[PDB]
């Protein structure tokens, strides 16, 4: 699995994110999943999953997304599936 497998790898990474996200809000023992989702949100400048949209508020309730609502630039954050796509492609 390498370069010519871009679409596959991204698909897996997104799935990985989903799993972490699901674990991060469902349980309170899952601290590694919380750390993983926080790191994805901070590194990729995203927040939430495009497939698990119903979880978004829970994600915010758990303080997993690092930006508040004072700055308008941070109100409209893209979900991490878009940011994963942008990462594995050259552009945005």
């Amino acid at each position: 699995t390498g370069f010519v497998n871009k679409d596959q790898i991204a698909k897996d990474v997104k799935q990985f994110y989903d799993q972490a996200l699901q674990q991060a809000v469902v349980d309170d023992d899952a601290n590694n999943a919380k750390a993983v989702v926080k790191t994805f949100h901070e590194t990729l400048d995203c927040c939430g999953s495009s497939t698990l949209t119903a979880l978004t508020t829970s994600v915010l309730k758990n303080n997993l997304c690092p930006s508040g609502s004072n700055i308008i630039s941070n109100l409209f954050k893209e979900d991490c599936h878009q940011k994963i796509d942008d990462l594995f492609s050259g552009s945005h």
Partner: antibody
Amino acid sequence: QVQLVQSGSELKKPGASVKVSCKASGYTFTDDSIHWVRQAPGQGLEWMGWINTETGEPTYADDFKGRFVFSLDTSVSTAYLQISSLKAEDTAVYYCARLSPVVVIFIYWGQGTLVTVSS
Amino acid sequence: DIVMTQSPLSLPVTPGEPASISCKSSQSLLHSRTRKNYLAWYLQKPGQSPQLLIYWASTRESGVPDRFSGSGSGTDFTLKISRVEAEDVGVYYCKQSYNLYAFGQGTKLEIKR
């Protein structure tokens, strides 16, 4: 648990001022902005504007630009709504709400403060 | 700015029957980058502050019963209740947050007898 607790009912005469408080708890108060919504008795909700809880800069809605002042005190995690030169039409319930990002909605509200202006 | 309009402004429903509330905005609420429709549905019950029911047009908030559902995109949106129950009476507002914030007139859901 997140809570926005506002001050009690106010009874003023036409021409005076009034200061309503909105104390936040359960989250970092300076992360999210605080918005104000007016509701006249028997009328709908109207967004009045918001205040940046980190810098203190207010932003007023067009219909509420003038006699309304959004102030702040982060030491006690409290937003304030001030109305000067009160008139009869200012009698209403004033809510504060916490804006959540990403979803851009008002999940957490205050119980509202009734302000009654009558000579 | 952006103007919100709700129909109908007064909705009496027989308990157990479905209900539908339409919401139309002057401009599109779809964000080109996030692909989200920044429209929400709040319910204000008698003597209470508004509570959030639906966000992003169709995502149900945690805890809201499944009989509440949102749909639509761009400028046309709808809030549906599969089975209207007694505890649902109150004023339903739609609110846009794409550019600033604006509430609809509100739909007072009452009981039909």
